[PDB]
Ligand SMILES: Nc1ncnc2c1ncn2[C@@H]1O[C@H](COP(=O)(O)OP(=O)(O)NP(=O)(O)O)[C@@H](O)[C@H]1O
Ligand SMILES: Nc1ncnc2c1ncn2[C@@H]1O[C@H](COP(=O)(O)OP(=O)(O)NP(=O)(O)O)[C@@H](O)[C@H]1O
Ligand SMILES: CC(C)C[C@H](NC(=O)[C@@H](O)[C@@H](O)[C@@H](N)CC(N)=O)[C@@H]1Cc2cccc(O)c2C(=O)O1
Ligand SMILES: CC(C)C[C@H](NC(=O)[C@@H](O)[C@@H](O)[C@@H](N)CC(N)=O)[C@@H]1Cc2cccc(O)c2C(=O)O1
Ligand SMILES: [Cl-]
C-alpha cells in the first residue's frame with residue numbers, strides 16, 4: 275500500500291460512506307485485504323460483491339474508467355471477467371472528499387464465481403487453461419478501440435513504481451544504472467498489433483478464480499499497454515514468487531509451467547518464438563518494479579532493521595542484474 | 609529484535625535506571641540501534657561508552673558473563689576488543705526487574721577507537737587486515753579455559769534462531785526438510801582444537817572499527833563454539849549481503865575478498881585446504897539462520913503484505929537449497 279494513502283485512510287469513516295452509497299449496513303462489509311487497494315466483501319440482497327477503495331494520490335476517476343472500458347470490451351467478446359456494478363446513484367465510481375484536497379474512490383464489482391487455486395488445483399491442467407485464457411485475452415485486445423482520450427491507460431514505461439529515483443535513496447547509484455539500462459534495452463523492442471496492446475499487466479493466482487476448470491479474472495487495476503510476452507512473463511514471475519506448491523528446482527518448475535502454458539496459449543493466439551529470448555529481461559523488470567513498490571510503501575526513516583535487511587538482498591539482485599531463473603526459454607520454440 | 613522483547617521494553621523507565629547505574633544524565637544517552645539489542649552511546653566526563661540492553665527472554669546473566677570471560681582472554685592475549693566496564697555498583701551486568709519475573713540486562717563497554725569502514729577503506733588492504741586479525745583470534749582461542757560451566761557458551765547447533773519450527777509456520781514442510789538436511793550434513797564434520805573452538809560467530813563491518821589499519825571488534829553477543837571455517841564463512845556472508853561498495857558480479861567479489869582474506873589469515877593461523885569445500889554449506893546455513901531470526905522478530909498475524917512478499921523470496925531460496933554464490937572456493941587452496 276502506498277504509504278501516503280495508508281497515512282490518510284480512516285476505515286470506519288469511509289466504510290460509513292460506502293453504507294449509504296451502496297445501500298448496505300456496516301455488518302454487510304467484510305475486510306479481505308489491503309495490498310494496493312482496500313478490498314472488502316459486500317453482501318446485498320442475497321448476493322456477494324467486492325468493494326475496492328483507493329485514493330487520488332494513486333488513481334484518477336478517468337483512469338479507472340479506462341479499466342472499466344477494457345473490462346466491457348473483454349466481456350462483450352466472451353471472456354469471463356468480473357464486471358463493475360453501479361452505485362445507488364448510478365455511478366461506476368463514487369468520489370468522497372477527504373477534507374484535504376483529495377478524494378477516496380469507491381467501486382464495486384461482481385464476485386467472481388469459484389475460488390482461488392489451491393494445492394489440488396496446482397497442476398498442468400491449470401497451467402494449460404491459463405495459457406488458453408491468456409491467449410484469448412490477447413487476441414481480443416487487438417480489436418480494442420479507446421472511446422475517449424480521457425480514459426487512456428498508461429504505457430508500460432510510465433509506471434509509477436518504475437520511477438525508482440522518486441522513492442529509493444539517491445545514493446543507490448548502481449541500482450539506478452541497472453534499472454536505466456534495462457528500460458533502455460526494452461525501449462529498443464518493436465511494437466505492433468500482434469506483439470503489444472492493452473493487457474492485464476498483473477496476472478497471478480490472487481487475481482483469478484477457478485470454477486470447475488473455468489477461469490474468471492479480476493484486479494484490472496494495473497492494466498496498461500505492454501508487450502504480450504511481458505504480460506506472460508509477469509504471470510511467470512508471480513508463480514515463481516508465490517508457488518502454491520513449493521518447489522526445489524526453480525528452473526525445472528519455470529520450464530514446465532511455461533511448456534504447459536504455451537501449449538494452451540498457442541491454441542488461441544500466435545506469438546513468435548523470437549519473444550521467448552526476452553523473458554529473462556521482463557522477469558528482471560518485474561523485480562525492479564517490486565523494489566520501487568516496496569519503497570513507495572515504506573518510510574525508510576521509520577522502518578525496522580529487519581525490513582532493511584530484506585531490502586538489502588533485493589537491492590543486490592538488481593545491482594547484479596541477476597537472472598530470476600537459469601531456464602533457457604528459447605528451448606520452448608515451436 | 610525479538611518480538612517478545614520489543615513488546616515489553618519500556619525505554620524511558622530503563623534509561624532512567626541507567627542514569628544512576630553508570631552516572632550519566634538522560635541527555636547524554638543517545639540511541640544508536642535496535643537490531644538484536646537496544647544500543648546507546650553514553651557520554652561521561654568527555655569520554656564515550658556503549659550501553660547495550662537486552663532481556664532475560666533471550667539472554668541470561670551467566671551466558672553474558674561467558675562472553676565477557678572470553679573477551680578478557682582475547683584482550684590478555686593482545687587482541688584489540690572492546691572490553692566491558694563495571695557499573696557504579698561494581699557489577700559487569702546490571703539487572704532491572706520488568707515487573708513480571710524477568711529482567712532487563714544492561715551492560716556497558718569501551719567505545720572502540722576509530723570508525724566504521726566506508727567506500728575509501730573497502731579494498732584489498734582491509735580484507736587482508738581482516739584475515740590477519742581473524743587468524744590471530746582463532747589462534748588465541750585455542751588456549752581459552754572456561755572457569756565454571758555456568759559461563760559456557762553454546763555449541764553451533766544449539767542456536768535459538770536455527771530452531772525454525774519454533775518460529776516458522778508448521779506448513780513450510782520443504783523449508784524444514786532442507787534445514788534439517790543441512791544441519792545433519794554439517795554434524796558429520798570433524799572437530800578438533802585446530803578446526804573448532806569458541807569464535808565470534810557474527811563478524812561483519814557493523815561489528816568492528818577501523819583506526820588507520822587497526823581493527824577493534826565488538827558485538828561479542830553471539831559468540832559460541834563453531835568451526836573456524838564457519839566463522840570465516842559468516843563474515844563472507846555478511847560482506848556479500850551489505851557490501852560497502854555494491855558489486856555487479858557476486859562470484860568475482862566473493863573470490864577476491866576470500867583471496868585477500870586468506871592471504872592474511874594464513875600468516876596467523878594454519879587451517880587445512882579441505883575446509884574450503886564447506887564454505888557453500890556454511891553460507892546456506894547462515895541463510896537458514898536469518899530466516900529464523902526474521903520469524904523470531906515478526907508476528908505473521910499482523911505484519912504487512914510487503915514484508916510477507918519479501919519473506920516469500922527468502923523462503924524459496926531455502927526451499928531450493930540455492931547456493932549463495934557460484935564461486936568455487938576450492939580454487940583458493942595452497
Ligand atoms: N471480482 C472479484 N471476485 C472475487 N474475489 C475478488 C474480486 N476482486 C478481488 N477479490 C478478492 O480480494 C482480493 C484482493 O483484491 P485485489 O483486486 O487483488 O486487490 P489489490 O489491492 O489490487 N491486490 P494486488 O493483487 O497485490 O494488486 C483478491 O485476492 C480476491 O481474493
Ligand atoms: N564497543 C563499541 N564501540 C563502538 N561502537 C559500538 C560498540 N558496540 C556497538 N557499537 C555501535 O553500535 C552499533 C550496534 O551495536 P551492536 O553491538 O552491533 O548491536 P546488536 O543489536 O548486537 N546488532 P547485530 O550486529 O545486528 O547483532 C554498532 O554497529 C556500532 O555502530
Ligand atoms: C504487496 C505486493 C508486493 C504483493 C504482490 N503483488 C504484486 O506484486 C503486484 O500486484 C504488484 O506488483 C502490482 N500491483 C504493481 C503494478 N504496478 O502493477 C503479490 C504478488 C502475488 C503473486 C502470486 C500470487 C499472489 O497472490 C500475489 C499477490 O497477491 O500479491
Ligand atoms: C536485523 C539483522 C538481520 C541485521 C543483520 N544482522 C545479522 O545478520 C546478525 O547480527 C545476526 O544474524 C546475528 N546476530 C544472529 C546470531 N544468532 O548470531 C545485519 C548483518 C550485517 C552484515 C554486514 C554489515 C552490517 O552492518 C550488518 C548488520 O549490522 O546487521
Ligand atoms: Cl471488516
Ligand SMILES: [Cl-]
Pocket residue numbers: 365366367368
Ligand atoms: Cl462513474
Ligand SMILES: [Cl-]
Pocket residue numbers: 397398399
Ligand atoms: Cl500435473
Ligand SMILES: [Cl-]
Pocket residue numbers: 699700701702
Ligand atoms: Cl555482574
Ligand SMILES: [Cl-]
Pocket residue numbers: 770771772773774
Ligand atoms: Cl527446527
Ligand SMILES: [Mg+2]
Pocket residue numbers: 480481493
Ligand atoms: Mg490482486
Ligand SMILES: [Mg+2]
Pocket residue numbers: 310476493495496
Ligand atoms: Mg491489484
Ligand SMILES: [Mg+2]
Pocket residue numbers: 814815827
Ligand atoms: Mg552488531
Ligand SMILES: [Mg+2]
Pocket residue numbers: 644810827829830
Ligand atoms: Mg549483535
